[PDB]
RNA sequence: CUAUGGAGCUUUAAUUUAUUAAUGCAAACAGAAACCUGCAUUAAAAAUUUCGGUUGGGGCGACCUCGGAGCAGAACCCAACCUCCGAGCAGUACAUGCUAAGACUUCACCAGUCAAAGCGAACACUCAAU
């Protein structure tokens, strides 16, 4: 019984493991994209500050 | 080391070596590596791999343990399903 | 001798019970790595569970 | 009553031979003191009228501190021995007759 | 038993004469209400960190005041440099402000005469000392 | 523990014996402030989410005294080094900033440093596309401000001690993104500071020299490696010579028409003003180099709102510790080499 | 000067309250109390044991592990005391997985280091010590 429960738990976890992996990778990619978008926003704000200076 | 016990007049055995070392009937002594469970997060995989092995002892240490253990531990055993059964005897050894 | 990093334990999300220790910065989020699991003979996610010690 | 246990194991002596005691066997540890245990109730059979129970022949469980000092010493009650309870059931039968 | 313990603390732990204990009981009655540990801490603070003796403390009624305000004013003066803790020899490089002036007068008069500093500075020091004391208690 | 006369007590006794006549009636307040905890200022990492951390600090009720000074510059009337943000609490406040947390960019949001240490950077008067030298840079409290300003194409930071060099490099890794430091834009070195007058003479435009000195604030609290130990008495005695030599080396390194900011975290005139005067006299005698100390009264008047200054300094400007504003102690002198 | 030889004395040296005294709880009575017993907290008075090496004054300090330079010129080793600078970290991966020929080694041992092939993946991490 213990062996069967272990095996079925492993199978259940591995059934949804690929979805978890792809969701985590998507989350990391979206975090990187948001960081780069914030970099672009900071560059725009620096350009606005330069415009104010000039 | 007790060369003559006070209740039997016979040599005693140190139990530290018994708990720490394994003796093969051929005369070799097998031990562990000091520190194979200590601070594994700062050790390389190769270092851990060679730390978690079983190694032999040299002639001086073998003689020391031979003196420190009695003849009961030097007998030949016939345990059923013994992992070290094939290692009790030397093969193709010259001098 | 300030302790900038801590040793933490990562367990597999596959339920195999496999786990390993890795060091991370204290001032950081909880880690979710992708590590090889010998039980399932492939790579699976590992999430931080418990902080072990500071180093 | 204080109860103690030896800290060190005493080697077996066998049958018909007393064990050999050592100086380290004199070291004891306190397992339990009985005087700190919860109290019990003494069960007895009455002979005269009492404030709690006023009928002769009723088995009553009362605190030892009272049963041992007031009921038994003055003869107001008797022990719940099997002989006593038989003798009281005899008079109960006589009354019911 | 509480009164017996308090008087035994005064006579044995604090080493006060019987007449001094009687005078303390007559003059500062809040000592009985006060717990033992804080009372001993106050007495030893006065004895060591202030260097005041038994006749002086029993004459000035030091034990009746709040340990918090005692700490605040004493530490403020010590950090100012107006108060110098007596050394092993009992000598002090500077004259010390009197206990009556440091405690019995108002905060305004205390600042005007001894501290010679601003009330805002005193309040800021009070906040800092409260933070330091709570941190010390947490550490202990 | 130590046997007798601990270093902290020795430092306190020396400071009493000297400043009791050096300052007059300010020594009580100065001593109380030095013995009490110092107020911290939050320097915003401009490379990170500066707007978001500014909003966070303003919700924490911190004010931008740098921006207030920028506003007051024209109100009172070389300007100052631009593109800097530092937040401090109101006068007399005891609230402390929470420990810094990393942002989405991977770099920490802000650095907790004494606000008085930012004054030399502002007085240095940085300009875009400049060249900066930083003697005794490590651990890098002022070099971080220089890089946040970001007006230097080449910054050469030097400090003798490899341990503090490593600490400065760790700070740079934590704050400055790797692409700025990958090139020769930042050059951290560990060599004697007296060599730069021959290694690179008339080379650098802005130079900041913060000579080693008996820091009173650290001396009165830290009990490890104090200048007032018996083993270090020789170093304490020889300290003014090293200070004047380092200032002379920095003046040699800077180019004619260049700017030198000499700063020290102490209150003693002997190590604040006499060092500068000895340096200028040595320049006049040995190397025939002329320098002009600028007037910083205009600089002082702007920051008098949030800082306490001593108005009896012959050459530079000195910020003294106070209970309302526990920043300091600090001293700095600005000089142009002609 | 040496002894991992003693002893006397002192104490905020380490380990204890066995003992005494005072409290509290329990037990036992009275109805409240006292004596005794057990278990805890305080003191008092005590009991056992000890002085790690270097720097010759002596204090005052510093030193004891590892790395580098002055240090033995050309395979290796080799100057102890000494003079000086550092280290007792940090950073990037998350196969920094698993097994397995043959070798090096700080002059012993303990430790420490390199690594063919093979399984499994992708198209034996940087750093002198740490
Ligand atoms: C007082 S700290 C200045 C820290 C930093 N500049 C700041 O303002 O936050 C000066 C440091 O310079 C280093 N230093 C001392 N003498 C030096 C010298 N002669 N040349 C270069 N650096 C030196 C010391 O290690 C000391 O920690
Ligand atoms: Mg010896
Ligand atoms: Mg003994
Ligand atoms: Mg070898």
């Amino acid at each position: 019984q213990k062996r069967r429960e272990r095996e079925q738990h492993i199978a259940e976890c591995m059934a949804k493991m690929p979805q978890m992996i792809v969701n985590w990778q998507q989350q990391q990619r979206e975090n990187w994209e948001k960081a780069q978008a914030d970099k672009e926003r900071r560059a725009r704000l620096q350009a606005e500050a330069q415009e104010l200076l000039g | 080391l007790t060369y003559f016990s006070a209740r039997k007049g016979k040599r005693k055995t140190v139990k530290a070596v018994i708990d720490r070392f394994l003796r093969l009937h051929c005369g070799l002594w097998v031990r562990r590596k000091a520190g194979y469970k200590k601070k594994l997060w700062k050790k390389t995989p190769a270092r851990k791999k060679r730390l978690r092995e079983f190694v032999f002892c040299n002639k001086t240490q073998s003689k020391l343990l031979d003196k420190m253990t009695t003849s009961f531990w030097k007998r030949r055993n016939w345990y059923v399903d013994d992992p070290y059964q094939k290692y009790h005897d030397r093969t193709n050894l010259k001098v | 001798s300030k302790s900038k990093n801590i040793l933490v334990r990562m367990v597999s999300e596959a339920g195999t019970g496999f786990c390993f220790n890795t060091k991370r910065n204290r001032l950081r989020e909880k880690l979710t790595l992708l590590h090889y699991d010998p039980v399932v003979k492939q790579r699976v996610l590992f999430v931080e569970k418990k902080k072990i010690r500071s180093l | 009553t204080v109860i103690v246990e030896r800290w060190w194991k005493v080697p077996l002596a066998g049958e018909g031979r007393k064990p050999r005691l050592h100086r380290r066997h004199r070291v004891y540890k306190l397992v339990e003191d009985t005087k700190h245990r919860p109290k019990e109730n003494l069960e007895l059979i009455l002979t005269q009228s009492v404030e709690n129970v006023g009928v002769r022949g009723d088995l009553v469980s009362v605190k030892k501190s009272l049963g041992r000092n007031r009921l038994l010493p003055q003869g107001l009650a008797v022990y719940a021995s099997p002989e006593n309870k038989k003798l009281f059931e005899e008079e109960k039968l006589l009354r019911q007759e | 038993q509480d009164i017996n313990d308090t008087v035994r603390l005064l006579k044995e732990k604090c080493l006060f004469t019987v007449q001094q204990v009687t005078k303390i009981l007559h003059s500062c009655p809040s000592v009985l209400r006060e717990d033992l540990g804080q009372l001993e801490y106050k007495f030893q603070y006065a004895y060591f960190r202030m260097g005041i003796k038994h006749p002086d403390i029993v004459k000035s009624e030091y034990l009746q005041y709040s340990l918090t305000k005692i700490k605040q004013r004493h530490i403020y003066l010590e950090r100012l440099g107006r108060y110098q803790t007596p050394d092993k020899k009992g000598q002090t490089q500077i004259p010390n402000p009197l206990l009556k002036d440091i405690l019995r007068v108002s905060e305004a008069e205390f600042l005007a005469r001894t501290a010679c500093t601003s009330v805002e500075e005193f309040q800021v020091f009070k906040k800092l000392l409260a933070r330091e004391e709570e941190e010390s208690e947490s550490s202990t | 523990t130590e046997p007798k006369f601990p270093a902290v007590r020795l430092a306190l006794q020396n400071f009493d014996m000297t400043y009791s006549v050096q300052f007059g009636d300010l020594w009580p307040s100065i001593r109380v402030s030095l013995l009490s905890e110092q107020k911290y200022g939050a320097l915003v990492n401009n490379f990170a989410a500066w707007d978001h951390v500014s909003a966070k600090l303003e919700q924490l009720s911190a004010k931008d005294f740098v921006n207030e000074a920028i506003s007051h510059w024209e109100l009172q009337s070389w300007a100052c080094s631009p593109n800097l943000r530092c937040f401090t609490f109101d006068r007399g406040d005891i609230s402390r900033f929470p420990p810094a947390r990393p942002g989405s960019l991977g770099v920490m949001e802000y650095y907790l440093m004494d606000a008085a240490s930012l004054l030399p950077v502002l007085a240095l008067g940085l300009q875009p596309g400049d060249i900066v030298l930083d003697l005794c840079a490590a651990p890098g409290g002022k070099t971080l401000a220089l890089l946040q300003t970001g007006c230097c194409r080449n910054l050469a930071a030097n400090d003798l001690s490899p341990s503090r060099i490593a600490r400065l490099q760790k700070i740079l890794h934590s704050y400055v993104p790797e692409e700025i430091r990958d090139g020769n834009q930042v050059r951290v070195t560990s060599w004697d500071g007296r060599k730069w007058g021959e290694l690179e003479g008339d080379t650098y435009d802005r130079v900041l020299v913060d000579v080693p000195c008996t820091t009173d604030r650290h001396s009165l609290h830290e009990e490890e490696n104090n200048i007032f130990k018996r083993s270090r008495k020789k170093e304490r005695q020889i300290l003014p010579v090293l200070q004047v030599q380092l200032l002379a080396a920095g003046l040699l390194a800077t180019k004619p028409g260049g700017h030198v900011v000499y700063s020290t975290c102490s209150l003693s005139h002997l190590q604040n003003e006499y060092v500068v005067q000895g340096a200028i006299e040595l320049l006049a005698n040995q190397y025939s180099i002329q320098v002009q100390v600028e007037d910083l009264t205009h600089f002082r008047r702007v920051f008098m709102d949030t800082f306490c200054f001593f108005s009896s300094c012959q050459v530079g400007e000195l910020v003294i510790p106070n209970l309302m504003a526990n920043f300091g102690p600090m001293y700095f002198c600005k000089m142009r080499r002609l």
Side-chain angles (χ1 to χ4, degrees), chain F residues 76-96:
Chain F
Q76 174 173 154
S77 179
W78 52 92
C80 60
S81 55
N83 210 25
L84 278 187
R85 304 177 183 93
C86 190
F87 290 81
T88 60
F89 289 94
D90 195 5
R91 301 184 59 90
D93 272 337
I94 201 40
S95 183
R96 55 165 57 86

PDB file of all heavy atoms in Angstrom, chain F residues 76-96:
ATOM      1  N   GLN F  76      18.695  82.271  -2.175  1.00  0.00           N
ATOM      2  CA  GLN F  76      19.769  83.001  -1.508  1.00  0.00           C
ATOM      3  C   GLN F  76      20.379  84.053  -2.426  1.00  0.00           C
ATOM      4  O   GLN F  76      20.647  85.183  -1.998  1.00  0.00           O
ATOM      5  CB  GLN F  76      20.847  82.037  -1.017  1.00  0.00           C
ATOM      6  CG  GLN F  76      22.066  82.743  -0.439  1.00  0.00           C
ATOM      7  CD  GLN F  76      23.058  81.790   0.198  1.00  0.00           C
ATOM      8  OE1 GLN F  76      24.251  82.079   0.276  1.00  0.00           O
ATOM      9  NE2 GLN F  76      22.566  80.653   0.669  1.00  0.00           N
ATOM     10  N   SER F  77      20.602  83.706  -3.690  1.00  0.00           N
ATOM     11  CA  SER F  77      21.201  84.629  -4.646  1.00  0.00           C
ATOM     12  C   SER F  77      20.254  85.780  -4.973  1.00  0.00           C
ATOM     13  O   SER F  77      19.068  85.570  -5.225  1.00  0.00           O
ATOM     14  CB  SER F  77      21.593  83.892  -5.928  1.00  0.00           C
ATOM     15  OG  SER F  77      22.151  84.783  -6.877  1.00  0.00           O
ATOM     16  N   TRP F  78      29.082  78.262  -9.298  1.00  0.00           N
ATOM     17  CA  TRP F  78      29.518  76.918  -9.653  1.00  0.00           C
ATOM     18  C   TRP F  78      28.401  75.907  -9.439  1.00  0.00           C
ATOM     19  O   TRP F  78      28.506  74.757  -9.868  1.00  0.00           O
ATOM     20  CB  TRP F  78      30.751  76.523  -8.839  1.00  0.00           C
ATOM     21  CG  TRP F  78      30.585  76.715  -7.366  1.00  0.00           C
ATOM     22  CD1 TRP F  78      30.148  75.793  -6.464  1.00  0.00           C
ATOM     23  CD2 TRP F  78      30.855  77.909  -6.622  1.00  0.00           C
ATOM     24  NE1 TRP F  78      30.128  76.337  -5.202  1.00  0.00           N
ATOM     25  CE2 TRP F  78      30.558  77.634  -5.272  1.00  0.00           C
ATOM     26  CE3 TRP F  78      31.321  79.183  -6.965  1.00  0.00           C
ATOM     27  CZ2 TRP F  78      30.710  78.587  -4.266  1.00  0.00           C
ATOM     28  CZ3 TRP F  78      31.471  80.126  -5.965  1.00  0.00           C
ATOM     29  CH2 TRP F  78      31.167  79.824  -4.632  1.00  0.00           C
ATOM     30  N   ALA F  79      27.335  76.350  -8.776  1.00  0.00           N
ATOM     31  CA  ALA F  79      26.158  75.522  -8.480  1.00  0.00           C
ATOM     32  C   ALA F  79      26.635  74.314  -7.673  1.00  0.00           C
ATOM     33  O   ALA F  79      27.407  74.493  -6.717  1.00  0.00           O
ATOM     34  CB  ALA F  79      25.419  75.205  -9.774  1.00  0.00           C
ATOM     35  N   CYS F  80      26.219  73.096  -8.006  1.00  0.00           N
ATOM     36  CA  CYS F  80      26.605  71.913  -7.249  1.00  0.00           C
ATOM     37  C   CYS F  80      26.484  70.702  -8.159  1.00  0.00           C
ATOM     38  O   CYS F  80      25.982  70.791  -9.282  1.00  0.00           O
ATOM     39  CB  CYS F  80      25.740  71.746  -5.996  1.00  0.00           C
ATOM     40  SG  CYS F  80      23.976  71.560  -6.341  1.00  0.00           S
ATOM     41  N   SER F  81      26.954  69.566  -7.662  1.00  0.00           N
ATOM     42  CA  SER F  81      26.859  68.324  -8.418  1.00  0.00           C
ATOM     43  C   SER F  81      25.398  67.919  -8.555  1.00  0.00           C
ATOM     44  O   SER F  81      24.714  67.750  -7.538  1.00  0.00           O
ATOM     45  CB  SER F  81      27.659  67.224  -7.729  1.00  0.00           C
ATOM     46  OG  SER F  81      27.249  67.067  -6.384  1.00  0.00           O
ATOM     47  N   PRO F  82      24.879  67.755  -9.771  1.00  0.00           N
ATOM     48  CA  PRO F  82      23.446  67.483  -9.933  1.00  0.00           C
ATOM     49  C   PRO F  82      23.103  66.004  -9.870  1.00  0.00           C
ATOM     50  O   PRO F  82      23.978  65.160  -9.657  1.00  0.00           O
ATOM     51  CB  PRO F  82      23.149  68.059 -11.320  1.00  0.00           C
ATOM     52  CG  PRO F  82      24.423  67.830 -12.071  1.00  0.00           C
ATOM     53  CD  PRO F  82      25.548  67.975 -11.066  1.00  0.00           C
ATOM     54  N   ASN F  83      21.818  65.694 -10.050  1.00  0.00           N
ATOM     55  CA  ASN F  83      21.331  64.320 -10.173  1.00  0.00           C
ATOM     56  C   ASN F  83      21.645  63.499  -8.920  1.00  0.00           C
ATOM     57  O   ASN F  83      22.209  62.405  -8.988  1.00  0.00           O
ATOM     58  CB  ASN F  83      21.902  63.652 -11.427  1.00  0.00           C
ATOM     59  CG  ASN F  83      20.966  62.616 -12.013  1.00  0.00           C
ATOM     60  OD1 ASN F  83      19.754  62.672 -11.810  1.00  0.00           O
ATOM     61  ND2 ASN F  83      21.525  61.663 -12.751  1.00  0.00           N
ATOM     62  N   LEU F  84      21.272  64.043  -7.763  1.00  0.00           N
ATOM     63  CA  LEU F  84      21.431  63.359  -6.487  1.00  0.00           C
ATOM     64  C   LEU F  84      20.144  63.471  -5.684  1.00  0.00           C
ATOM     65  O   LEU F  84      19.477  64.509  -5.702  1.00  0.00           O
ATOM     66  CB  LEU F  84      22.597  63.930  -5.675  1.00  0.00           C
ATOM     67  CG  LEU F  84      23.988  63.419  -6.042  1.00  0.00           C
ATOM     68  CD1 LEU F  84      25.019  63.922  -5.046  1.00  0.00           C
ATOM     69  CD2 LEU F  84      23.996  61.902  -6.106  1.00  0.00           C
ATOM     70  N   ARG F  85      19.803  62.392  -4.982  1.00  0.00           N
ATOM     71  CA  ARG F  85      18.610  62.336  -4.146  1.00  0.00           C
ATOM     72  C   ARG F  85      18.984  61.708  -2.815  1.00  0.00           C
ATOM     73  O   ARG F  85      19.468  60.573  -2.776  1.00  0.00           O
ATOM     74  CB  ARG F  85      17.495  61.533  -4.823  1.00  0.00           C
ATOM     75  CG  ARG F  85      17.107  62.036  -6.201  1.00  0.00           C
ATOM     76  CD  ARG F  85      16.059  61.142  -6.840  1.00  0.00           C
ATOM     77  NE  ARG F  85      15.730  61.577  -8.191  1.00  0.00           N
ATOM     78  CZ  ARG F  85      16.319  61.121  -9.287  1.00  0.00           C
ATOM     79  NH1 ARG F  85      17.266  60.200  -9.231  1.00  0.00           N
ATOM     80  NH2 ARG F  85      15.947  61.601 -10.471  1.00  0.00           N
ATOM     81  N   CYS F  86      18.775  62.446  -1.730  1.00  0.00           N
ATOM     82  CA  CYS F  86      18.994  61.921  -0.392  1.00  0.00           C
ATOM     83  C   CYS F  86      17.865  62.393   0.510  1.00  0.00           C
ATOM     84  O   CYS F  86      17.466  63.560   0.465  1.00  0.00           O
ATOM     85  CB  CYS F  86      20.352  62.353   0.171  1.00  0.00           C
ATOM     86  SG  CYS F  86      20.822  61.512   1.700  1.00  0.00           S
ATOM     87  N   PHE F  87      17.355  61.477   1.326  1.00  0.00           N
ATOM     88  CA  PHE F  87      16.190  61.721   2.163  1.00  0.00           C
ATOM     89  C   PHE F  87      16.570  61.588   3.629  1.00  0.00           C
ATOM     90  O   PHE F  87      17.259  60.637   4.014  1.00  0.00           O
ATOM     91  CB  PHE F  87      15.058  60.750   1.821  1.00  0.00           C
ATOM     92  CG  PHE F  87      14.423  61.008   0.488  1.00  0.00           C
ATOM     93  CD1 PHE F  87      15.018  60.558  -0.677  1.00  0.00           C
ATOM     94  CD2 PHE F  87      13.229  61.700   0.399  1.00  0.00           C
ATOM     95  CE1 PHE F  87      14.435  60.794  -1.905  1.00  0.00           C
ATOM     96  CE2 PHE F  87      12.642  61.939  -0.826  1.00  0.00           C
ATOM     97  CZ  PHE F  87      13.246  61.485  -1.979  1.00  0.00           C
ATOM     98  N   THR F  88      16.125  62.550   4.435  1.00  0.00           N
ATOM     99  CA  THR F  88      16.309  62.526   5.877  1.00  0.00           C
ATOM    100  C   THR F  88      14.995  62.911   6.539  1.00  0.00           C
ATOM    101  O   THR F  88      14.127  63.535   5.923  1.00  0.00           O
ATOM    102  CB  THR F  88      17.419  63.482   6.340  1.00  0.00           C
ATOM    103  OG1 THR F  88      17.092  64.822   5.953  1.00  0.00           O
ATOM    104  CG2 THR F  88      18.758  63.092   5.732  1.00  0.00           C
ATOM    105  N   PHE F  89      14.853  62.527   7.803  1.00  0.00           N
ATOM    106  CA  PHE F  89      13.656  62.869   8.549  1.00  0.00           C
ATOM    107  C   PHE F  89      13.726  64.312   9.045  1.00  0.00           C
ATOM    108  O   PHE F  89      14.762  64.977   8.968  1.00  0.00           O
ATOM    109  CB  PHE F  89      13.461  61.907   9.718  1.00  0.00           C
ATOM    110  CG  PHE F  89      13.053  60.526   9.302  1.00  0.00           C
ATOM    111  CD1 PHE F  89      14.000  59.535   9.115  1.00  0.00           C
ATOM    112  CD2 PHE F  89      11.720  60.216   9.097  1.00  0.00           C
ATOM    113  CE1 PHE F  89      13.625  58.262   8.732  1.00  0.00           C
ATOM    114  CE2 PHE F  89      11.339  58.946   8.714  1.00  0.00           C
ATOM    115  CZ  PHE F  89      12.293  57.968   8.532  1.00  0.00           C
ATOM    116  N   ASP F  90      12.597  64.793   9.560  1.00  0.00           N
ATOM    117  CA  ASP F  90      12.517  66.162  10.044  1.00  0.00           C
ATOM    118  C   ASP F  90      13.433  66.354  11.249  1.00  0.00           C
ATOM    119  O   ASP F  90      13.905  65.395  11.865  1.00  0.00           O
ATOM    120  CB  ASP F  90      11.071  66.510  10.407  1.00  0.00           C
ATOM    121  CG  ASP F  90      10.846  68.005  10.562  1.00  0.00           C
ATOM    122  OD1 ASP F  90      11.786  68.784  10.298  1.00  0.00           O
ATOM    123  OD2 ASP F  90       9.727  68.402  10.950  1.00  0.00           O
ATOM    124  N   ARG F  91      13.696  67.619  11.573  1.00  0.00           N
ATOM    125  CA  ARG F  91      14.588  67.938  12.680  1.00  0.00           C
ATOM    126  C   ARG F  91      14.043  67.378  13.987  1.00  0.00           C
ATOM    127  O   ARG F  91      12.869  67.565  14.318  1.00  0.00           O
ATOM    128  CB  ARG F  91      14.770  69.450  12.791  1.00  0.00           C
ATOM    129  CG  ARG F  91      15.343  70.099  11.546  1.00  0.00           C
ATOM    130  CD  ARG F  91      15.580  71.580  11.767  1.00  0.00           C
ATOM    131  NE  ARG F  91      16.490  71.819  12.880  1.00  0.00           N
ATOM    132  CZ  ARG F  91      17.806  71.915  12.761  1.00  0.00           C
ATOM    133  NH1 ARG F  91      18.404  71.802  11.587  1.00  0.00           N
ATOM    134  NH2 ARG F  91      18.542  72.131  13.848  1.00  0.00           N
ATOM    135  N   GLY F  92      14.905  66.687  14.729  1.00  0.00           N
ATOM    136  CA  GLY F  92      14.527  66.098  15.994  1.00  0.00           C
ATOM    137  C   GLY F  92      13.848  64.750  15.903  1.00  0.00           C
ATOM    138  O   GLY F  92      13.548  64.158  16.948  1.00  0.00           O
ATOM    139  N   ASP F  93      13.594  64.244  14.699  1.00  0.00           N
ATOM    140  CA  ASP F  93      12.959  62.943  14.558  1.00  0.00           C
ATOM    141  C   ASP F  93      13.934  61.822  14.895  1.00  0.00           C
ATOM    142  O   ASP F  93      15.146  61.937  14.698  1.00  0.00           O
ATOM    143  CB  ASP F  93      12.419  62.754  13.142  1.00  0.00           C
ATOM    144  CG  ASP F  93      11.007  63.276  12.983  1.00  0.00           C
ATOM    145  OD1 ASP F  93      10.294  63.380  14.003  1.00  0.00           O
ATOM    146  OD2 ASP F  93      10.607  63.576  11.839  1.00  0.00           O
ATOM    147  N   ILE F  94      13.386  60.726  15.412  1.00  0.00           N
ATOM    148  CA  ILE F  94      14.176  59.554  15.771  1.00  0.00           C
ATOM    149  C   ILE F  94      13.889  58.360  14.875  1.00  0.00           C
ATOM    150  O   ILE F  94      14.594  57.342  14.979  1.00  0.00           O
ATOM    151  CB  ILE F  94      13.967  59.174  17.254  1.00  0.00           C
ATOM    152  CG1 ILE F  94      15.133  58.330  17.775  1.00  0.00           C
ATOM    153  CG2 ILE F  94      12.645  58.443  17.437  1.00  0.00           C
ATOM    154  CD1 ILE F  94      16.484  58.792  17.284  1.00  0.00           C
ATOM    155  N   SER F  95      12.899  58.452  13.990  1.00  0.00           N
ATOM    156  CA  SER F  95      12.552  57.330  13.129  1.00  0.00           C
ATOM    157  C   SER F  95      13.720  56.962  12.223  1.00  0.00           C
ATOM    158  O   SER F  95      14.449  57.830  11.735  1.00  0.00           O
ATOM    159  CB  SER F  95      11.318  57.670  12.292  1.00  0.00           C
ATOM    160  OG  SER F  95      10.926  56.571  11.489  1.00  0.00           O
ATOM    161  N   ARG F  96      13.897  55.663  12.003  1.00  0.00           N
ATOM    162  CA  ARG F  96      14.990  55.136  11.204  1.00  0.00           C
ATOM    163  C   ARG F  96      14.452  54.478   9.941  1.00  0.00           C
ATOM    164  O   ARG F  96      13.353  53.916   9.931  1.00  0.00           O
ATOM    165  CB  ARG F  96      15.815  54.121  12.000  1.00  0.00           C
ATOM    166  CG  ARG F  96      14.992  52.987  12.585  1.00  0.00           C
ATOM    167  CD  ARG F  96      15.875  51.839  13.037  1.00  0.00           C
ATOM    168  NE  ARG F  96      16.876  52.264  14.006  1.00  0.00           N
ATOM    169  CZ  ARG F  96      16.668  52.336  15.313  1.00  0.00           C
ATOM    170  NH1 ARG F  96      15.496  52.034  15.844  1.00  0.00           N
ATOM    171  NH2 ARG F  96      17.664  52.717  16.107  1.00  0.00           N
TER     172      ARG F  96
END
